[PDB]
Amino acid sequence: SWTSFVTPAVFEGWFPNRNPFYTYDGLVSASNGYPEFGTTGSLDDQKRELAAFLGNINQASGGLQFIQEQNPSDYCDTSSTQYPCAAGKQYYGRGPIQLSWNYNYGEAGADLGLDLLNNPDLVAQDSTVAWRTALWFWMKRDCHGAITASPPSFSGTIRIINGGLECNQPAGSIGNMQMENRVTYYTQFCQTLGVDPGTDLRC
């Protein structure tokens, strides 16, 4: 199990100022629903996956200090008709991975059997739902396959999570800096776990 290397102490050391809404046990419990997460490939692939998942979360949530996107648009894409926006509701970033947009809340809600399209706030109000949405995005959108492949691709996870705004950005631009911060956190977490991060890091 991945909890053998990401212990409560490792987690607390990485997120010392986390909002109390986010707990280690919450992540563990939610991960039980995605048995392949952190158990795919070699032990080093397992370590890289946890470092990549939590490194991306470190960037998105500000070290788990934030539950909701700070100073957000309502993120309702009217061209995305499969998952209809609910009147007055907003799909700004929520949870560890800052799940955004009606299309992600809708697909996640469908896969998780949750009322996320009509009640997106559940992601910021129920920590079990919050962790499940982060793991759901990671698995369903295939950040999992990107990082656990041989060779591993941390860059692939960034592309999938927020590539339009963070990848292929001029060096030093805000998007490029966010991208580099994800790489910095991933490599720092890999150092804690004693694993090589791989060479495919930036996008």
Ligand X SMILES: CC(=O)N[C@@H]1[C@@H](O)[C@H](O[C@@H]2O[C@H](CO)[C@@H](O[C@@H]3O[C@H](CO)[C@@H](O[C@@H]4O[C@H](CO)[C@@H](O)[C@H](O)[C@H]4NC(C)=O)[C@H](O)[C@H]3NC(C)=O)[C@H](O)[C@H]2NC(C)=O)[C@@H](CO)O[C@H]1O
The CA-atom distances, in angstroms, between 78 and each of 74, 86, 101, 131, 135 are 11, 11, 10, 27, 26
Query: Residue 190 in contact with residue 152, Cβ under 8 Å?
Result: no
With H, G, I as helix, E, B as strand and everything else as coil, classify residue 99: strand
Query: Residue 93 in contact with residue 178, Cβ under 8 Å?
Result: no
155 counts as binding ligand X under rule CB under 6 A = no
CB of 188 to ligand X, least distance (A): 14
Q: Of the ranges 57-65, 122-130, 144-152, 186-194, which one interacts with ligand X (CB under 6 A)?
A: 57-65
Q: Select from 31, 46, 90, 98 the one that contacts ligand X (CB under 6 A).
A: 98
Task: Give 153's strand partners.
Answer: 200
Give CA–CA dist 131/98, Å, rounded: 11
Q: Select from 100, 148, 169, 176 the one that contacts ligand X (CB under 6 A).
A: 100
Q: Of the ranges 13-21, 22-30, 33-41, 100-108, which one interacts with ligand X (CB under 6 A)?
A: 100-108
Q: Select from 30, 52, 90, 93 the one that contacts ligand X (CB under 6 A).
A: 93
Q: Which residues contact ligand X (rule: CB under 6 A)? A: 59-62, 66, 69-70, 93, 97-101, 104, 137, 161-162, 164-165, 177-178, 181
